[PDB]
Amino acid sequence: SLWTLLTGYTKKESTIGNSAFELLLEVAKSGEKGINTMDLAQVTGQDPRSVTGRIKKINHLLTSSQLIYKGHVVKQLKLKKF
DNA sequence: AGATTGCAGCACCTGAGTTTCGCGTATGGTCACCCACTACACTACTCGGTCAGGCTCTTACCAGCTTAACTACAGTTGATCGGACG
């Protein structure tokens, strides 16, 4: 049901991998504030290459835009509903 | 019409053809980092010219004389020059 409510599909058939789904859960927790890709990377505990390669699987669910943070160039992520 | 026997029907364990799958193994693709090369504008030390300072060499002497040449006066002859010719 959590899978279905967030992705629109059940765990039994959804195309999103477990790691990418946990990324989505972090964006779900942050809601209206959303998460920048580096704080997401730090909180999930994985590197920016891995985060970027995974985020492709969910870019249709997320509104995004560029921003500059701690001298690095990053994007903000928000679920469409927020 | 009974003692001997086969048909074949019931049920349950089993087997392969067929399928879906997981992984190896390996291949094209994302993207993040940091490197090499280039270059417009700059930093800064030296060399170089110019100037003064002031120590330095070398001159040539005054009138006279006494060792040395010129420096004017002077006369018939050049050959460019004017200006007109062909």
Residue type, A23: L
Contact A35, A22 (CB under 8 A): no
Alpha-carbon dihedral angle through residues A58, A33, A1, A9, given to the nearest 10 degrees? -20
Resolution in Å equals: 3.8
Cα(A41)–Cα(A51) distance, rounded to whole angstroms?
6
Which helix (H) or strand (E) covers residue A72, if one does? strand A72-79
CA distances from A39 to A3, A20, A46, A52 (A): 23, 15, 11, 13
Residue type, A26: E
Cα(A12)–Cα(A42) distance, rounded to whole angstroms?
29
Distance A68 CA to B39 C1' (A): 29
Residue type, A56: K
Cα(A38)–Cα(A50) distance, rounded to whole angstroms?
12
- Residue A48 Cβ under 7 A from any strand B atom: yes
Distance A42 CA to B72 C1' (A): 120
Q: What is the 8-class DSSP label of residue A66?
A: E
Query: Which tokens sit at A78?
Result: 């928000």
Nucleotide nearest to A48 (CA to C1'): B32
- Residue A52 Cβ under 7 A from any strand B atom: yes
